[PDB]
Design a protein around this ligand. Structure first.
Ligand code: ZVB
Length: 435
């Protein structure tokens, strides 16, 4: 696996031991061969679990999710997928790793796709080796892979709104359920319905993940309501998964705005990972998987792959060369390598709008490419009235950095900046010049 010019896909089924058994063996061999190695975790939660599995081995943890005293003797680095892509974009030198290991390599967030693209290009060039660890590599068509113990799979109508009758099976259960919803707003409604029925519910999403996931270990719960983020190696002591089989799809329309289309079907890879949360204990057969729709290849034309090309076009590889997307996911976007390459000052603005501004990649690119500087927020207010952002069915308003009350009406509208209350609160703070 460790030879230069080789990319291996470690596709053992979910729960087969890729992280706790195989990963430490790979790391020991890499250290024996003096290979400068990077290990990429999808989340801070997975980074902390990796430290437990690799404890005793000389690994430099480039994350505050682990409190360790590094010796300075480490040639193996561990960081999140997003951190790797961020450091590549910034004017910080990233070592040319001889071995690149990505855990939960199916992650479809733009920084994860860009990291696979950069790594696979280095391997293709003959410069490095790579190992992508996932039960569901890109283009997998099997939503029902093997498990540690038999699973009871049942196709059934799953509620996506509060209900008063017709779904007794949901609440009659006495175990612990993990329920995948298509959005934070949809989970809020289902959680409120379950709480009204006497259930103890924890909600998980990208922005709350680390904090709320700790509650699944610290307190008793009946349901965990989560978005697709729990497909990335989140483990639960549960006996049932309820899966809506739905997700939202960001779509760029006329190259001018981004909408959150759907809810629409998940991919086979996502369905297999949602199901993969249960059937993990060989001593507990009969965990249930209830699924409420079919699968489809909804990653085709999904904005994350176009956003990954915007990131890769702005990462130095060698002279004017630009990294390609990883071959099995390269057709998900119709884009020319290099079309989003920015000049030095516009590139720095694009990076700061993502890193400090916390803007979606597509929106950060529109602002930087228009020649606007990071702190200039006039674009948040000079769009057409069809770009007015609404709060509780009335236009959202903020006090500008000049002390003037204005309606939020961005020049470019990206639905992700107002997808839920927390996102809109963050965007209002940005529009006001507060970061
Ligand atoms: C634990 C945190 C503070 C951290 C460690 C580290 N090492 C190298 C480069 C960046 C780094 N960040």
């Amino acid at each position: 696996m460790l030879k230069k010019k080789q990319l291996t896909v470690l596709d053992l089924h979910p729960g087969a031991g890729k992280t706790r058994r195989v990963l430490p063996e790979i790391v020991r061999e890499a250290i024996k061969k003096r290979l400068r190695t990077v290990i990429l975790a999808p989340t801070r939660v997975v980074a902390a679990e990796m430290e437990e599995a690799l404890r005793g081995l000389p690994v430099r943890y480039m994350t505050t999710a682990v409190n360790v005293t590094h010796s300075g003797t480490e040639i193996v680095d561990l960081m999140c997928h997003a951190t790797f892509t961020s450091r590549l974009l910034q004017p910080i030198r990233v070592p040319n790793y001889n071995l690149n290991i990505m855990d939960e390599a199916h992650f479809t967030d733009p920084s994860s796709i860009a990291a696979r693209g950069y790594i696979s290009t280095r391997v293709e060039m003959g410069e490095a080796a790579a190992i992508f660890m996932t039960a569901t590599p890109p283009g997998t068509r099997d939503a029902f892979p093997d498990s540690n113990s038999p699973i009871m799979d049942t196709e059934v109508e799953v509620p996506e709104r509060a209900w008063s009758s017709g779904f007794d099976w949901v609440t009659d259960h006495s175990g612990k359920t993990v329920w995948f919803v298509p959005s934070v707003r949809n989970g809020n409604e289902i959680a409120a319905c379950l709480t009204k029925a006497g259930k103890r519910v924890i909600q998980l999403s990208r922005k709350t993940f680390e904090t709320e996931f700790q509650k699944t270990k610290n307190q008793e719960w009946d349901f965990v309501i989560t978005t697709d983020i729990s497909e990335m190696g989140a483990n639960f002591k549960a006996d049932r998964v309820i899966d809506s089989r739905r997700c939202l799809k960001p779509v760029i329309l006329d190259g001018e705005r981004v909408i959150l289309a759907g809810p629409m079907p998940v991919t086979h890879a996502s369905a297999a990972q949602r199901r993969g949360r249960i059937g993990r204990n060989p001593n507990k057969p009969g965990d249930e998987y209830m699924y409420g729709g079919g699968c489809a290849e909804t990653d085709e034309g999904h904005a994350h792959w176009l956003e990954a090309r915007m990131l890769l076009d702005n990462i130095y590889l060698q002279d004017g060369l630009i990294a390609s997307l990883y071959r099995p996911e390269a057709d998900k976007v119709a884009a020319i390598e290099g079309e989003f390459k920015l000049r030095t000052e516009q590139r720095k603005t694009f990076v700061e709008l993502m890193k400090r501004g916390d803007l979606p990649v597509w929106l950060a690119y529109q602002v930087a490419s228009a020649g606007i500087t990071y702190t200039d927020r006039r674009w948040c207010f000079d769009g057409t009235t069809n770009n007015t952002i609404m709060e509780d069915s009335v236009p959202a308003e903020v006090w500008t950095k000049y002390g003037e009350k204005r309606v939020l009406k961005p020049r470019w509208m990206d639905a992700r900046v107002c997808s839920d209350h927390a996102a809109l609160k963050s965007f209002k703070e940005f529009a006001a010049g507060k970061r």
